[PDB]
Ligand binder design. Structure first.
Ligand SMILES: NC(=O)c1ccc[n+]([C@@H]2O[C@H](COP(=O)([O-])OP(=O)(O)OC[C@H]3O[C@@H](n4cnc5c(N)ncnc54)[C@H](OP(=O)(O)O)[C@@H]3O)[C@@H](O)[C@H]2O)c1
Ligand SMILES: NC(=O)c1ccc[n+]([C@@H]2O[C@H](COP(=O)([O-])OP(=O)(O)OC[C@H]3O[C@@H](n4cnc5c(N)ncnc54)[C@H](OP(=O)(O)O)[C@@H]3O)[C@@H](O)[C@H]2O)c1
Ligand SMILES: NC(=O)c1ccc[n+]([C@@H]2O[C@H](COP(=O)([O-])OP(=O)(O)OC[C@H]3O[C@@H](n4cnc5c(N)ncnc54)[C@H](OP(=O)(O)O)[C@@H]3O)[C@@H](O)[C@H]2O)c1
Lengths: 559, 559, 562
């Protein structure tokens, strides 16, 4: 683009980083103050107004205003300290910010598609001004991680999710499109809220809902190609699994709340095997919770056990799940399709504490959002059954964790191998022993998986890709970090980890003939590197050249 | 315009006030949340976030963000209570906001032209995306009313000034262009400020400066027409008068700090004549100060005295001016071109207090920014020389006023006729007498003058136009308001007052053959009304029609 | 910028785009790999032009050239304005559209129909140019020499506007041709399957007048009250009524009435330099009493009054003959403007008898009757006065009152001749040679348009047409007059038009009709700077740097921040 419109284009606007030469060539000289700053100075300037804010919500506001006007500077900020800003642009801040302030974007960020637009979605896609779309993150806003049904305010979550695609993975932000599907909201606070900007009726459900999702997938892939990545985020439990089984083999589709969760949890389990010095086959798993996360983790664990050599039926029997009505056993009431797959041949047990005592698991995984469920008795039991028990308190936020890092290290007398979903500072026990517990962040998974899928036009995303991604993450951890109790690589290395994930995934796709991109690159690393988006400003070079003087003399006819 | 770009166009974007029908016709459906609000609801929504701000500066920030995205809603806010928002978008807030925060506009608002762009101004005008420009407000930022040399940060002042053109006058905002001329700054705080975004050298002066202003006037009128209104704002004293005498007869040009100040001050004097029941010829004026304001007021007073019948030389001798070195008398040192015009035949007098006693003025006008200069002795002297003395404490801000309204009413025992430049709440003396002092706001003048000039293509703005504007303002005051000590009409009536000013001015121009617009309208009020900009959203009607059925049958050829 | 410049005829230079301009505009690869001068382009197109051997075929090639490269189109036209004026305008344009319809492959103007009433402002927005300063409008009812061509009449404003630019230097991009289609009365068009206009008869009455009223209002609302609107080829009654209704309300004139009058009077004033007598010593007989006659006669009275003759005495010098005979007081079949020139005289039915009684010093044929200037009429003139004036203005050549040869032969070399149609040089049997001039309207309207547009003259009073006539009459050299030439050479039309623009501009500021300000001190330097040239424009980017030290202080990095 040229002229005034370039300053309103978030992908090309440099603000005062436009050189005088660039302003003149673009025909915008005089629209910008008479000062010429480097990007590094722009970073310093914006960071001063960043620290003056008294809340995380206000810092999210500042960053959204910056993303509105200068996308290159926005990702300069995010990548300068990814671990610091990830909790601001995404969870847990984005949900709290949208729940309190609504949507604060002053430039349209994506598409709002309602159930009442059924039959006209193709036309609505045409309102988005980018034609080269390769990744779509979509939500209906029914299960925002930690806050529930936010309805139309849930648009902030795909916006924040995609920011991490780019900041942590190097996915081209211009090829990304966040979509909000508004079928209504069941949040009584929103339906009586006079400032609510979504559909003020209860959620449409049943086939009429599925019809809209069907048209959405068809419309997106009709306009952008069947290779378009479509990631589902923050869908309720029943819809999440149904939609995944329906589309995962027909479209380029995955659900991060199920599959990304599974891979990073399995990654922590594999890293802990390097400490326990046993095989995955030697383990017995008890799940505190039996929803989206627990089902995803359990299914990927079985897939990993199968690769070690354990047949599927045998591997399934190593998994015990406790839901809100007790242990899931054959013949219990209140079971469903997913739950019957893991129903053990056992009498009814009501309490998690009793299940720990009966089955004596080598690892317990908490994904039920019940605070303190890993009691002192449970931790002490686990530390007496096995030398190095594995304690995953994955529920979010921190106030809903199954236990604290300090309580696990103290009660297990420093032998528990711990990981959480929420960040815990380093623990040092009375005896001097020091532990640095790791956080199982989904951003370890979905940025690199998306980069390799987009890079090679990987047509579908089978669960083998999430398994090999977990194996890759597990081997990122160094021996020193294992010595400290860290089961995950540092977040400051996330762009390197994602790039190595993208190459492994790309290599896997070509070997299974799943990649669409042609021809297959010989140097997969160089290929993926060439697609990584950098916060560095591009240059508006002109590409002027001349012809040989003799050729120009002969080709120019005068009198 | 159509498509995505309409949401980024501040003059067409309605936000959620776009009907579903409008979104579909524009091809933007899905870019806006699924809610359809009236402008009145938008006003309520934005006013809630307005009241939560703890400072005027933060409220200016909120309004600038709104002007960035929705100009119709912005002027809906301003016109809902003009008296309330005028101090926020313009003085005194705008100067304090820009001095502390810099420039906060996230959409280019005008043109920055530097001394180093000399010879290339025509090209720079082409960066502004509006071709139909009819009004330009320009500053070099050397004398920001109340804060001094703000350099490049002075861009906020023309932006705020033009907002009042539209809010108080109905001038079309899309035809308005604010310009900042950066020749440097002499503000030592800015030159050592690492965040300053202007030219970091002292101000260029002399002919090299005038050369740049010469090219600026030529470039603007070459591109937009010689009828383009060019108002100068916040120029230092020497430059202000020199530039005015140079351009006022060659271009459509005026300086509000000199001429708008003069007309509203003379307006207060004329309104006070309705209380004093004497002629302007019966008055003796003493000026506290002898700068831009005092010279402008004095020159217009002489022009008014001349119209009552007093010859120029005699009328001049009714004006006494005191500067920083005492009374201005023939043969004094430290006089200049303007000051010699009012030099009295009198010995040197050092103090204002002594001048009041010697000459016994009927009216004292304070424009020197010296706090408390109208002492208790001066007020008591004035109240003993004349029955109804006129006390104008015009210096800004309130802390620099020559006296308070309460001190004038108390010391003169309720007989002083008072006006100020800063707002004073109503005074009630011990004896029950109640006074509602008026504020001499320049916005009484420049919005209506600009509307009539723009409406009729008035080629030049002679001082007779500012005189008749003052006579119009004076007669706006009702008898009841005079009974209360109010010398100016209420600010809530400013759009009506400006419209009546615009008609009078337009009528004056056609009678003196100064108007360019052709043909002369018979109903001047209807003509000017048709040019008043309203905050009401326009409609994207399609204008579809058909031909007579028989005509279409005959004009359509098939097989 | 981009591919679209090659489709923009105002910017497209074809193979004259240098490599550097092609790369800069982002069009490299769209044009063959050769770079041509405009002079070479001119030579190539001229070769194609001469291989054609129809005037119609030469019109088509020039139109497709105008379709793609406007600067080159006008370089062709200006290289020999006399050669191409007949091809792009009268008489070829009328015959071209009559036979081929509209050959334009790029939209040239606006078609506004009676059925579009109430939406004319919307249709003006279809024209991609916003800065229009001259509009030529027709309804196609009286195409000069051909009659009612209906919607095929669009070719005439397009050809007319090309002469505004070629002879006058008016900016072509600021001009808009308009066809108002209210139907047609041509029975051959109404029955024609290929006809592209409204296939019903011409709407007349209030609905017609209201459409024209809206057109004037819509054009000036969008383009400004100063926008020149010139009416072309309307029928007689509409032409005069519309002229009287708008000439004081808008910037308006009718070239068939006023431009014709201007160039006819110019020829007469030039002829006074041969006859060496005052205009008040003359008696005029008009063959024809219609659009052209009334225009010329009214301007003749004006020039007689300026010479000082009372108006009633001046009007009495004019005798008019229509299709019923002499226009007397007390005849039947006499209209409005006809009573103004009726004479207290017995009825006379033949032009021959009128000439024998009145013994006029000048006869002017504007009736389109071939051979009306009989040998008897010519022989009578030459015996009544030593140098009689014979103006055979009817077009085309076949409908002229007499040929130049016949005038010079029968008048024994003493007749002063001018025609509307171009007659070649005449050499009589005794050896005497004459070079008869053509009273071309292009002598008048390009210079008047240029002066009016340059000054923002709000209205065009007939004094401007009179002073234009006086200017043209002074242009002719003394040598050319000795050879019978009453008009300057058509090759000088651009210079003549510039000089006319200056006088018109001088007149306008003296009587405060010019709205452009500031008034230019030097009227010619002012108009010169507005003449459009066929020179290709430059694509030079305005690039520059700030002084080194000033730029170093304004460039902030992480090292030099504090
Ligand atoms: N990488 C991460 O850190 C990560 C990722 C994803 C999710 N999580 C967290 O995992 C937790 C659950 O996520 P989700 O998506 O699976 O939610 P979900 O779909 O709603 O599933 C919730 C599960 O918890 C069960 N439950 C509720 N109360 C229980 C109780 N007293 N005892 C045992 N089970 C109980 C529920 O039983 P019923 O089936 O009977 O209702 C249900 O099975 C959340 O806190 C989430 O933040 C963490
Ligand atoms: N409608 C309004 O309310 C309105 C409009 C415009 C301005 N004002 C106010 O008027 C005041 C002056 O404005 P301006 O533009 O004229 O500023 P200015 O151009 O700088 O002139 C200041 C004048 O005050 C004189 N002065 C300074 N100290 C003095 C002292 N002790 N005694 C007497 N005179 C003294 C100065 O004398 P020297 O010449 O010797 O330096 C100078 O003549 C400001 O406060 C301004 O806010 C009000
Ligand atoms: N620059 C030029 O050389 C120039 C410019 C313009 C026009 N012309 C030519 O002037 C001629 C007329 O043009 P126009 O616009 O004036 O057309 P017009 O108004 O429609 O008709 C002109 C007159 O011809 C009269 N007429 C018809 N038959 C006649 C006859 N036997 N005897 C005497 N008069 C007769 C008609 O009389 P009625 O009223 O009774 O019907 C009518 O008044 C055309 O040939 C045109 O080409 C030349």
């Amino acid at each position: 683009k040229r002229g005034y419109d370039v300053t309103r284009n978030p992908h090309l606007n440099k603000g005062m980083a436009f050189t005088l030469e660039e302003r003149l060539q673009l025909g915008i000289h005089g629209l910008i103050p008479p000062c010429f700053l480097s990007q590094d100075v722009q970073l310093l300037r914006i960071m001063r107004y960043y620290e003056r804010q008294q809340s995380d919500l206000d810092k999210y506001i500042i960053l959204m205003t910056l993303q509105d006007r200068n996308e290159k500077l926005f990702y300069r900020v995010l990548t300068s300290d990814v671990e610091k800003f990830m909790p601001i642009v995404y969870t847990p801040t984005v949900g709290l910010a949208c729940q309190h302030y609504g949507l604060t974007f002053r430039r349209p960020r994506g598409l709002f598609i309602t159930i009442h637009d059924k039959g006209h979605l193709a036309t609505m896609l045409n309102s988005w001004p980018e034609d080269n779309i390769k990744a779509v993150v979509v939500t209906d806003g029914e299960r925002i991680l930690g806050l529930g049904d936010l309805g139309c305010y849930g648009m902030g979550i795909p916006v924040g999710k995609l920011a991490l695609y780019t900041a942590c993975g190097g996915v081209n932000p211009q090829q990304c499109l966040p979509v909000l599907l508004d079928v209504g909201t069941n949040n009584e606070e929103l339906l009586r809220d006079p400032l609510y900007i979504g559909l003020k009726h209860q959620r449409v459900h049943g086939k009429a809902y599925d019809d809209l999702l069907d048209e959405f997938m068809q419309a997106v892939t009709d306009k952008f190609g069947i290779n378009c990545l479509i990631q589902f985020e923050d869908f309720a439990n029943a819809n999440a699994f149904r939609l995944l089984n329906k589309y995962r083999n027909k479209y380029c589709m995955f659900n991060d709340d199920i599959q990304g969760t599974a891979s990073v949890a399995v990654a922590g389990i594999l890293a802990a095997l390097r400490i326990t010095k046993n095989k995955l086959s030697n383990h017995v798993f008890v799940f505190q919770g039996a929803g989206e996360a627990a089902m995803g983790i359990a299914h990927l664990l079985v897939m990993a056990l199968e690769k070690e050599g354990v047949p599927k039926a045998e591997a399934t029997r190593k998994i015990w799940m406790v839901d809100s009505k007790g242990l899931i056993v054959k013949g219990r009431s209140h079971l469903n399709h997913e739950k019957e797959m893991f129903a053990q041949d056992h009498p009814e047990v009501n309490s998690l504490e009793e299940v720990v005592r009966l089955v004596k698991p080598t690892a317990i995984i908490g994904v039920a959002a019940i605070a303190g469920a890993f009691t002192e008795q449970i931790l002490r039991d686990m530390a007496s059954f096995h030398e190095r028990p594995i304690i995953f308190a994955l529920s979010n936020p921190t106030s809903k964790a199954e236990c604290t890092a300090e309580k696990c290290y103290r009660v297990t007398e420093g032998r528990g191998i711990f990981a959480s979903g929420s960040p815990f500072k380093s623990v040092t026990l009375e005896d001097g022993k020091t532990f640095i517990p790791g956080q199982g962040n989904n951003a370890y998974v979905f940025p690199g998986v998306a980069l390799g899928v987009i890079a090679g036009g990987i047509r579908h995303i089978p669960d083998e890709i999430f398994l090999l991604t977990a194996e890759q993450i597990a081997q990122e951890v160094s021996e020193q970090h294992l010595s400290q109790g860290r089961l995950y690589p540092p977040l400051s290395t996330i762009r390197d980890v994602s790039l190595r994930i993208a190459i492994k995934v790309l290599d896997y796709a070509y070997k299974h003939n799943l990649a669409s991109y042609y021809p297959e690159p010989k140097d997969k690393e160089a290929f993926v590197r060439s697609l990584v988006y950098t916060p560095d400003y591009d240059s508006f070079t002109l590409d002027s050249y001349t012809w040989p003087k003799e050729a120009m003399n002969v080709q120019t006819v005068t009198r």
